[PDB]
Automatic annotation (TrEMBL):
Top-rank taxon: Bacteria
Protein name as it appears in the record: NO-binding heme-dependent sensor protein
Species for this entry: Shewanella oneidensis (strain ATCC 700550 / JCM 31522 / CIP 106686 / LMG 19005 / NCIMB 14063 / MR-1)
Annotated positions binding heme b: 2, 103, 114, 132, 134, 136
Pfam families: HNOB (PF07700)
């Protein structure tokens, strides 16, 4: 888990709960004197432990917190990597470009990143079928990021997530319908 993800999480937690809460979370869940360097890889367990704590504090499902973070995360990534996002003229182009374009540019900018397996099909009814697979099981973060990307492009969307790893499947299937 690259530090940039933790950095955007910090922005969210600090903005919503204050720096003392963020530092408390780091004391509880990260090694002593932890500082998240954007380019460096960290144990994904640190991220999950932090988000698990937040979710339990709010008495919410962890996956709803993860989805909220995902939506927040798109702007966090877009802001830090504007050149990458600027490559896309619309929502559909971005989503269909996750596999080819995003994956490439991240591997160019980061040392040994851990990216999900994402594959998109544009269907003749102009729905997008997005397959997700990852050991991290962060499909709800993916769902959140898609909504974030939709907001960015001023595009309204609906997502059906009727196959999911969290129920035992070896992948998730996110059907994205663009609406008016
Ligand atoms: C709708 C658009 C996107 C989706 C669905 C998506 C999906 C994801 C997900 C779900 C993760 C969590 C890791 C995992 O699941 O294994 C991730 C990680 C990541 N994504 Fe994306 N992403 C999107 C856009 C972007 C963009 C625009 C960038 C720009 C650079 C980006 C760069 C990254 C980076 C740097 C990581 C962390 C990799 C690591 O921790 O090693 N993503 N992505
Ligand atoms: Zn899923």
């Amino acid at each position: 888990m690259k530090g940039i993800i933790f950095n955007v999480l910090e922005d969210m937690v600090v903005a919503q709960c204050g720096m003392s809460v963020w530092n408390e979370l780091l004391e509880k869940h990260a090694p002593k004197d932890r500082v998240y360097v954007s380019a460096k890889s960290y144990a994904e367990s640190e991220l999950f432990s932090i988000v698990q704590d937040v979710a339990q504090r709010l008495n919410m499902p962890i996956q709803d917190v993860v989805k909220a973070f995902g939506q927040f995360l798109f702007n966090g990534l877009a802001s830090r990597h504007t050149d990458v996002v600027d490559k896309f003229d619309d929502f559909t182009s971005l989503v269909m470009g996750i596999h080819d374009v995003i994956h490439l540019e991240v591997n160019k900018l980061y040392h040994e990143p851990s990216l999900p397996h994402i594959n998109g099909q544009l269907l003749p009814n102009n729905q997008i079928a997005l397959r997700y697979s990852s050991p991290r099981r962060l499909c709800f973060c993916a769902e959140g990021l898609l909504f974030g990307a939709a907001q960015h492009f001023q595009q309204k969307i609906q997502i059906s997530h009727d196959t999911c790893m969290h129920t035992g499947a070896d992948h998730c299937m996110l059907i994205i319908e663009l609406q008016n």
